[PDB]
């Protein structure tokens, strides 16, 4: 089904309506109406600082790796996380640790080089890294942005009880 | 009409390749072996021509590898020997073809470890 | 399972033969894939011809070029494999016509034909080093001004070999070897085992 | 053998338009360092010019010959219309990069695969 | 050199990066020789060296204004390939975010058209919008842009519960904001001025130069790739082309505020009628088990683990599927060996078949014009560059 | 210091960085949080180890407690079960 | 009679019959020097053929337009002198011409 | 094999126990192959792996706890599909797909067998056999890996 | 304590070089970063200027190669962590107008003194000290004579510690350049005794740099106080008249009395927004160039110098006007060169 | 959330009545074609000019 967007007698009053429409400007003032009304309207800015735009529970954010209530570290690098990173992003070496359970030695997100896809919450079977809703973490170096375990840990420490209720409301969905 | 040319086609010269990795890179033209740890054959039906490995060198600041030769991770298939010979004359990097080696046949029968006699 | 219309399937193979027919001397090969789209191939010296009947011809008119594009089976003697994918707005239908070039054969140009090429052909040129005949401006298009090497070739490192940063000393950007700070990882993923073909 | 031809015939006609070619960047070189505000000197820049049409002086197929005038011209084009900034001129002249010894001492001092 | 200048990379009139080297006779242009690749990033091999799944991401970067509908044409191919379809809910998802997202390319098209044109308003007043719509992308993806939802298989989790009802409320009065640009601007005593008589293309010449898109329809050339060759469920749906009379940057205009229009109504019917369902097929081969399962059943685990480590493994071929995003014919052709990772992926962006129109379009023409068409041709150069 | 106990060294040429800039390091190790964690005693021979939570857990593994003279250990979460 | 097509450049073309009529006339006589049992001169002549005997037949343009389809009546003339410069240009061409030479060995062999 | 499973009883454990210092045997991951009891009889002379009992609770493993110390050892995790008994040096240090994989010749003894030296980012991880029909077919040494 | 050299010479490289250096900011100083970060070596940069003014130096150095730490002269503490993890100190502390609060003994000697002398307590393999070329205890400038103060201190502070001795240096940025061809804004050019008996010869910067760097990364050099000289000498007169030359701008060399001129460098030196020209500055434009008898610099530190002519069209191409900026050296005719 | 003076102010100026539709958001053989040619489309009966 189709549609003419712009498809198409002379009359005293016809012409006299189009010759008043270019000499006193008519459609002009209309528009002029237009803006004058939003003036009126109450203006959608957020001071940003003091209120925040909403992000529901899927934002991706900021990379975390949570540990168990009991304290031990999730992760167990099974490192499927670093084969499905679309950039190259995480790096994983691993080693039994003296527990002779499977940890990571060093797991180093570049940041710079993460495009926050998000994939990594999806594959991790543990759920050990995951997307933590904060997104504030400008730097003023380079090198801040690399983060290795330690910096993603803390970061899962310290976003833990969001992180939790988010995963919380989303789980079933996934 | 067609015009006659002996030189092997070298194109060297339009590859755009630097000096220093047309000359010094040495290729293998090898088909892979199988990991030991499974028992499929499917990865050791092509043959593969691989340059030389290089410099690997741990990153200062976060310990990462770090690697100079580009063309490293360039590892590319070719389904029989004589078109990855090829390959390597034109482009002008160096080969040493590795001859396919298969499993010989070998003879099984269910039969033959019931014998006491041996 | 996708929902097949073996309507489309049989018509395509049709018009496969029509054109066999008609163009004995240039289509090698007409095949009507599975996902029912329909592929004539064609000798490199049938480019200006096979095209031309397709955009003129009232049977089978193809007005306009989808695209044109170079896949490099390094193996192949011929190692690029220029694809033209053409779409019929009266008879609703989309053919590809695909060809074979070698490095130093040139192709000839479509821009005769469909002036929709005069830039695709130029981004075949610089990322695959097929040359086209007859091209009004061949020129690099998508690669640096001063690049060295087709990218898009099979045979090309993906980072490349030169890369730029700012030196005081010259106060310019200058090209120095790629040195990468941590080096593509490059996963092995083809598993040993294959897939009974259905 | 038996190759079809891309623009001459025969090593000979393909040299004539080699020699085309050089004529037409000697005649630029000048004009570009000028163009450009480049630091160089033209006598300097035209050594180039000799080193670059030299460096595929070996070639001997009249088709690789027939690509590389092709590619040569159009690089030509680029320059003398300042599609191509002085960056990018320069980078010709390798200026910034630390030239390498080809001794082999001198790299057994210093890398690990030479 | 006739004054050749340097439209210049850095240019608020020229989105993105466009060097278009000009050379014009005072204000009159003579030749128009666009510049390419300053935003070419090799989209192209990256993916050839990618598995599937990690290749989707990409697409929403080709163009992002227009995030997912770039998405469905890689899904669409790699489901071709592998002969399997989305299930019914996740086919009306990708038509109901299909053209949510049309209208968001459209709001940036006549929006940023505008900016340079001069007029700031429009802008502001729909960019209030478009952020009311990314929050539908985000509370369905988790990314404002950029989302990855829409995955080779169907989506990646159904909608959240509650935001059909939201992309009601918005749907339900987007018009009024539509009609309001009018009032300002497809009457406009100025607008008209500048954008009518200003590119006209020729039916037989749009064709010609490959454009297949609101360049052809606005030309009269009636074709939408949505009702001739339909894609997902959009033949369910019933809607009406914009086609295009007089075609010039005015009347292809009309088009483009015409199918803010028309992707209202279907919109509403999707909401009126999407399925109860699942959203992704039920073949672990292809998509990836649900967490629960993975975490309980053996063999969900073991497909979880090689479809994120290793891949779909399409069966060899090759496909050239086009939809009908919101600039133009979208089509992906994505030749595949049996891989887990794609051997080719030719991009065919609507936008490197507008561009070289530009030469065709822009002669003997104003300096501002040249603005006015690079914004009729809603050039990303993302696409373009690929 | 760190889990693995990264020591830059006095001699290092890395320990530069910290200098005016602390260094990441984590309290509560986890090395040592599941063996401050009580074994979990059970009945029968078998016990599972969701993680806790199920979905939000780990791959559901059955552990075998079947000799006291070893309290299985989920290779996940480290948690010793005494029979 | 029509006001415009709607395509944008196409014009209006009155006694439009009678364009068409010279035009189907003219390929058919070019086809006739085509090889005998040329593909191409069987097949264009059938399609001409019926193109034609449909004009001549019908004196109403809007129902012409139905019988060959074509949309409007304008786009078939462009059509058949297209065609008619093809003919022109494949009798140079010579396509009935048996094939210049078979692909390479394993040239189309797409699994690799 | 199947999308999904419909196996919804419960599972059944074995018991981990010491084969010695190179092979982790986490036998809760045998599928009762045989292999190992053939190879550590066939290939290797051993004859110490046999099979335990009947029923689902067959393990293969050895009835007294005798370390499985032979040459020619470390090439049952090679043989063992699943990861059951699999290398305790080479835990848990990497995954296979990152492992770039160099085909070389094992100088630790004169047979000069075949092997493949697997490197992660610039040090070796594993050395693992491969098939040379004359000098070692699919087997190397305790000490060559 | 060392770092073994791998990668393939280039940014993203590893050489083993941690270094001080603790007036960076500088003209020589930017070049030394330069070739120390291309290199790879690990610099750290000690600075007391804003943090925006450091800013250029960061993107030379790769990621982690560059650490910039916060110093102050008079507070011992800074210099003692800046060489905590160093092993070589580079020193170019210098100035030419005394400031008010820091005296020509201070940037030259007082200062370069400490730094070394915790630079050893430290345990640096080994410490560059920079001091200008000919300087006598005795001579006429107390800048160059305070210099010489130092290169002794610092020896007895720290023994064995090369002393480059740097003669004026030419580049982008210099003074000795830009200065006289700056003399266009007045009208006429000064000259002491005419621009004569001044003879004066010229190093690039990068030459001093490149050699600079080479001493870090060589045994050969301890306790050497090599002089980085030239390629050719000049009396002052071509080299001011050349500056115009490339500038293109007109000469009127003018005979003024050192003794009145002296005074024209104190009304600058007056001002107080870093004085144009020094009292001492005049005194040492005037100081004729030493002839070399002493451990030679550049080639015997592995850099052959690099002639003025060369690169003086880069340095004073900003000096030219509309037209004249588009003039290059080979057309105009370089000045004659006086040994003497 | 506006007094209905300056809300009419709006609505006048607009031309329309914003209230409804607000900014703030609240809780031989046959020559054979390709396919068969395409049928003409259909002029939307709705709306078939704007
Ligand atoms: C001029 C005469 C007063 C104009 C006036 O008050 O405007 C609001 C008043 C109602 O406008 P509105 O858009 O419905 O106000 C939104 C809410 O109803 C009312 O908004 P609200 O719910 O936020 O009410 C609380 C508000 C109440 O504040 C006020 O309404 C008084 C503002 C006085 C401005 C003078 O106080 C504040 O929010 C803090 C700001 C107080 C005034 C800030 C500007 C002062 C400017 C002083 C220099 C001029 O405008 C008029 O009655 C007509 C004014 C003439 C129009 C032509
Ligand atoms: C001026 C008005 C400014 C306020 C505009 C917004 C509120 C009114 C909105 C009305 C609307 O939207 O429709 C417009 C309408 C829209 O008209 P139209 O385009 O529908 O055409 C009307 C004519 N027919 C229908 C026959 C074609 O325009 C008018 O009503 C007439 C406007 C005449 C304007 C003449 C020029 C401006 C006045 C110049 C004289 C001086 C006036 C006083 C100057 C200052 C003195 C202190
Ligand atoms: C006895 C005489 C009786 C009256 C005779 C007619 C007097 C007319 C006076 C105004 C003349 C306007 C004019 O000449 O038109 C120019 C242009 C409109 O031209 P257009 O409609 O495009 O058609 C031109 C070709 N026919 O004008 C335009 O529309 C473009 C102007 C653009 C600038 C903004 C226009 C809107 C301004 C709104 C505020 C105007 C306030 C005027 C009063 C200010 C306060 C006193
Ligand atoms: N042509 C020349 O300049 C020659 C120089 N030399 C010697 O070489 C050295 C380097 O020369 P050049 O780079 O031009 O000198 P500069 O005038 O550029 O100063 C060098 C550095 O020293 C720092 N500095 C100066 N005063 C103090 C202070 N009181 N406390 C701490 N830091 C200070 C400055 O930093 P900031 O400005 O941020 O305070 C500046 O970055 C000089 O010491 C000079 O004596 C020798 C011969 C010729
Ligand atoms: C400063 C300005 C920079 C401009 C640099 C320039 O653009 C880049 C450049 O010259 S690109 C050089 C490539 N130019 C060729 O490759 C020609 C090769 N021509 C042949 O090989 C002949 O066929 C022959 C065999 C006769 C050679 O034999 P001979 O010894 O030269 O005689
Ligand atoms: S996937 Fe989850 S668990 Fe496995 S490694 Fe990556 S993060 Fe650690
Ligand atoms: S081989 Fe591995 S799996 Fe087969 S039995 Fe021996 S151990 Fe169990
Ligand atoms: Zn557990």
């Keep these: ?174 | 009409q067609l015009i006659t040319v002996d030189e092997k086609l070298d194109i060297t010269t339009l590859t755009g390749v630097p000096e220093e990795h047309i000359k010094t890179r040495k290729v293998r033209i090898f088909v892979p072996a199988r990991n030991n740890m499974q028992s499929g054959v499917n990865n050791t039906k092509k043959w593969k021509m691989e340059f030389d490995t290089r410099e690997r060198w741990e990153n200062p600041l976060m310990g990462w590898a770090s690697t100079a030769d580009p063309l490293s991770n360039m590892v590319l298939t070719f389904s029989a020997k004589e078109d990855a010979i090829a390959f390597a004359e034109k482009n002008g990097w160096s080969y040493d073809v590795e001859e396919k080696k298969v499993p010989k046949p070998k003879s099984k029968s269910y039969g033959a470890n019931f014998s006491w006699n041996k | ?198 | ?114 | ?386 | 210091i760190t889990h693995t106990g990264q020591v830059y060294d006095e001699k290092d040429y890395r320990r530069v960085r910290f200098v005016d800039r602390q260094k990441e390091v984590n309290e509560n190790f986890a090395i040592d949080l599941i063996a401050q964690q009580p074994v979990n005693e059970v009945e029968h021979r078998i016990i599972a180890c969701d993680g806790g939570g199920g979905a939000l857990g780990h791959p559901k593994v059955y552990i075998n407690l079947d000799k006291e003279t070893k309290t299985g250990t989920c290779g996940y979460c480290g948690l010793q079960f005494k029979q | 009679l029509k006001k415009t097509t709607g395509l944008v450049g196409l014009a209006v073309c009155d006694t439009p019959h009678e364009r068409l009529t010279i035009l189907y006339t003219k390929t058919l006589d070019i086809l006739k020097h085509f090889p005998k049992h040329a593909a191409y001169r069987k097949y264009t002549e059938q399609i001409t053929n019926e193109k034609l005997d449909m004009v001549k037949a019908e004196p109403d343009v809007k129902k012409l337009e139905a019988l060959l389809q074509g949309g409007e009546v304008e786009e078939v003339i462009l059509q058949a002198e297209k065609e008619l410069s093809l003919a022109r240009k494949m009798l140079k061409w010579k396509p009935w011409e048996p094939l210049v030479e078979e692909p390479p060995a394993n040239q189309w062999k797409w699994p690799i | ?145 | ?340 | ?50």
């Design chain 5, 1 to 386: 050199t006739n004054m050749t200048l340097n439209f210049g990379p850095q240019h608020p009139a020229a989105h993105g990066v466009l060097r278009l080297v000009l050379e014009l006779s005072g204000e009159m242009v003579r030749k128009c020789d666009p510049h390419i690749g300053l935003l070419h990033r090799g989209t192209e091999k990256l993916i050839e060296y990618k598995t599937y799944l990690q290749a989707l991401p990409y697409f929403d970067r080709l163009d992002y204004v227009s995030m997912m509908c770039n998405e469905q044409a890689y899904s669409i191919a790699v489901e071709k390939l592998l002969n399997i379809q989305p299930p019914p809910r996740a086919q009306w998802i990708r038509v109901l975010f299909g053209e949510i997202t049309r209208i968001l390319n459209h709001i940036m098209a006549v929006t940023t058209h505008a900016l340079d044109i001069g007029a700031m308003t429009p802008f502001f007043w729909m960019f209030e919008e478009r952020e009311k719509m990314f929050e539908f992308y985000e509370r369905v993806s988790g990314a404002r842009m950029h989302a990855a939802y829409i995955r080779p298989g169907g989506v990646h989790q159904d909608l959240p519960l509650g935001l059909l009802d939201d992309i009601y409320e918005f749907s339900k009065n987007f018009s009024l904001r539509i009609d309001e640009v009018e009032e300002m601007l497809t009457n406009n005593r100025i607008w008209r001025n500048r954008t009518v008589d200003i590119g006209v293309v020729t039916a037989e010449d749009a064709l010609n130069y490959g454009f297949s898109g609101v360049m052809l329809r606005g030309s009269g050339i009636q074709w939408d790739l949505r009702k001739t060759q339909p894609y997902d469920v959009y033949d369910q749906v019933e809607f009406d082309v914009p086609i295009g009379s007089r075609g010039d940057c005015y009347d292809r205009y009309l088009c483009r505020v015409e199918e803010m229009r028309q992707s209202l109504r279907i919109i509403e019917q999707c909401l009126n009628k999407m399925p109860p369902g699942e959203i992704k097929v039920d073949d672990a081969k292809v998509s990836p088990p649900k967490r629960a399962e993975m975490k309980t059943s053996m063999e969900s685990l073991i497909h979880h683990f090689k479809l994120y480590t290793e891949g779909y493994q399409v069966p060899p071929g090759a496909t050239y599927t086009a939809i009908e995003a919101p600039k133009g014919e979208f089509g992906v052709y994505l030749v595949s060996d049996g891989s887990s990772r794609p051997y080719r992926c030719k991009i065919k962006a609507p936008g490197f078949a507008h561009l070289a129109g530009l030469d065709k379009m822009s002669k003997g023409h104003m300096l501002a014009d040249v603005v006015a068409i690079i914004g009729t041709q809603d050039i990303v150069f993302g696409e373009i560059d690929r």
């Design chain 9, 1 to 340: 304590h060392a770092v073994i050299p791998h990668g393939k010479g280039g940014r993203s490289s590893v050489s083993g070089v941690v270094a001080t250096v603790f007036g960076a900011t500088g003209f020589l100083g930017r070049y030394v970063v330069n070739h120390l970060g291309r290199m790879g070596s690990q610099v750290i940069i000690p600075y007391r200027c804003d943090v925006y003014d450091i800013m250029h130096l960061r993107l030379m150095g790769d990621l982690g190669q560059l650490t910039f730490l916060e110093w102050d002269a008079r507070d011992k503490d800074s210099i003692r962590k800046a060489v905590q993890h160093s092993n070589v100190v580079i020193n170019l502390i210098g100035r030419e107008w005394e400031t008010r609060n820091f005296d020509f003994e201070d940037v030259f000697v007082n200062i370069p003194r400490a730094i070394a002398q915790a630079s050893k307590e430290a345990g640096v393999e080994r410490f560059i000290h920079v001091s200008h070329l000919n300087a006598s205890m005795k001579s006429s400038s107390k800048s160059l004579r305070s210099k010489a103060v130092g290169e002794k201190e610092v020896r007895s502070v720290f023994p064995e510690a090369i002393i480059i001795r740097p003669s004026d240096i030419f580049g982008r940025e210099d003074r000795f350049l830009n200065h006289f061809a700056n003399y266009r804004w007045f009208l006429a050019v000064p000259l002491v005794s005419l621009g004569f008996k001044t003879v004066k010869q010229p190093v690039y910067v990068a030459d001093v740099s490149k050699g600079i760097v080479n001493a870090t990364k060589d045994p050969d050099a301890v306790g050497k106080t090599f002089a980085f000289t030239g390629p050719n000498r000049y009396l002052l007169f071509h080299l001011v008249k050349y500056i115009f030359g490339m500038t293109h701008r007109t000469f009127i060399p003018y005979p003024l009395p050192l003794f009145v001129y002296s005074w024209i460098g104190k009304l600058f030196g007056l001002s107080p927004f870093e004085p144009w020209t020094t009292k001492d500055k005049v005194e040492r434009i005037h100081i004729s160039d030493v002839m070399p008898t002493d451990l030679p610099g550049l080639e015997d530190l592995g850099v052959q110098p690099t002639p003025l002519e060369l690169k003086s069209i880069e340095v004073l191409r900003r000096h030219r006007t509309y037209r004249w900026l588009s003039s290059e050296i080979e057309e105009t005719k370089p000045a004659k060169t006086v040994n003497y």
């Design chain 3, 1 to 198: 399972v996708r929902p097949r219309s073996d309507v489309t399937h049989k018509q395509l193979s049709a018009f496969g033969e029509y054109v066999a027919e008609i163009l004995p001397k240039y289509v090698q090969q007409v095949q009507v894939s599975c996902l029912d789209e329909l592929e004539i191939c064609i000798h490199p010296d049938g480019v200006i011809p096979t095209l031309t009947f397709l955009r003129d011809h009232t049977n089978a008119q193809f007005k306009s070029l989808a695209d044109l594009t170079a896949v490099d089976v390094p193996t192949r003697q011929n190692r690029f494999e220029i694809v033209y994918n053409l779409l019929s707005l009266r008879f609703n239908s989309r053919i590809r016509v695909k060809t074979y070039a070698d490095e130093l054969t040139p192709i000839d140009s479509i821009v005769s034909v469909h002036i929709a090429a005069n830039w695709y052909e130029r981004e075949v040129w610089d990322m695959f080093g097929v040359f086209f005949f007859n091209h009004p401006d061949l020129r690099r298009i998508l690669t640096d001004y001063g690049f060295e090497g087709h990218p898009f070739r099979k045979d090309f490192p993906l980072t490349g070999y030169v890369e730029l940063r700012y030196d005081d000393e010259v106060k310019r950007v200058v090209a120095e070897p790629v040195e990468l700070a941590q080096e593509f990882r490059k996963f092995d993923l083809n598993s040993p085992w294959e897939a009974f073909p259905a």
């Design chain 1, 1 to 174: 089904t189709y549609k003419y967007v712009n498809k198409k007698e002379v009359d005293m009053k016809s012409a006299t309506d189009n010759a008043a429409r270019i000499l006193m400007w008519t459609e002009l003032i209309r528009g002029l109406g237009m803006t004058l009304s939003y003036l009126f309207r109450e203006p959608a800015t957020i001071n940003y600082p003091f209120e925040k735009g909403p992000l529901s529970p899927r934002f991706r954010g900021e990379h975390a790796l949570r540990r168990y209530p009991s304290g031990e570290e999730r992760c167990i690098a099974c490192k499927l996380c670093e084969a499905i990173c679309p950039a190259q992003a995480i790096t994983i070496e691993a080693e039994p640790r003296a527990d002779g359970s499977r940890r990571t030695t060093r797991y180093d997100i570049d940041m710079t080089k993460c495009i926050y896809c998000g994939f990594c919450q999806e594959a991790c079977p543990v759920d050990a890294i995951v997307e933590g809703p904060n997104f504030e973490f400008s730097t003023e170096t380079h090198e801040e942005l690399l983060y290795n375990k330690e910096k993603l840990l803390n970061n899962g420490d310290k976003w833990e009880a969001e992180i939790a209720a988010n995963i919380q409301a989303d789980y079933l969905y996934r």
């Design chain 4, 1 to 114: 053998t038996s190759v079809k031809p891309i623009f001459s015939r025969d090593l000979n006609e393909a040299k004539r338009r080699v020699r085309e070619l050089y004529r037409a960047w000697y005649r630029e070189v000048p004009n570009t360092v000028h163009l450009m505000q480049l630091d160089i000197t033209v006598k300097q820049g035209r050594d180039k010019v000799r080193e670059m049409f030299m460096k595929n002086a070996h070639v001997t197929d009249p088709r690789v010959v027939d690509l590389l005038v092709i590619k040569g011209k159009m690089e030509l084009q680029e320059t003398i219309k300042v599609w191509k900034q002085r960056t990018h001129v320069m980078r010709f002249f390798h200026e910034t990069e630390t030239p390498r010894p080809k001794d082999f001492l001198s790299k057994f001092y210093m890398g690990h695969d030479p």
């Design chain 10, 1 to 50: 959330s506006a007094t209905r003076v300056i809300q009419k102010l709006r609505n006048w100026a607009s031309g329309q009545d914003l209230q409804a539709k607000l900014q703030l958001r609240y809780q031989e053989k046959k020559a054979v074609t390709p396919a068969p040619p395409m049928k003409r489309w259909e002029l939307s009966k709705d709306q078939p000019y704007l």
């Design chain 8, 1 to 145: 094999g199947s999308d999904r499973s419909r196996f919804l009883e419960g599972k059944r454990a074995v018991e981990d126990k010491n084969i010695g210092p190179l092979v982790k045997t986490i036998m809760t991951r045998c599928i009762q192959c045989t292999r190992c009891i053939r190879f550590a009889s066939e290939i290797a002379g051993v004859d110490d792996l046999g099979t335990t009992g009947r029923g689902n609770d067959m393990q293969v493993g050895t009835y007294i706890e005798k370390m499985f110390m032979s040459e020619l050892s470390g090439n049952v995790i090679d043989i063992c599909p699943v990861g059951a008994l699999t290398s305790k040096p080479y835990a848990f240090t990497a995954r296979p797909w990152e492992t770039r994989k160099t085909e070389s010749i094992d100088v630790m003894d004169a047979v000069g067998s075949n092997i493949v030296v697997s490197t992660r980012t610039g040090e070796v991880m594993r050395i693992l056999p491969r098939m040379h029909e004359d000098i070692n077919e699919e087997w190397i040494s305790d000490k060559t890996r």
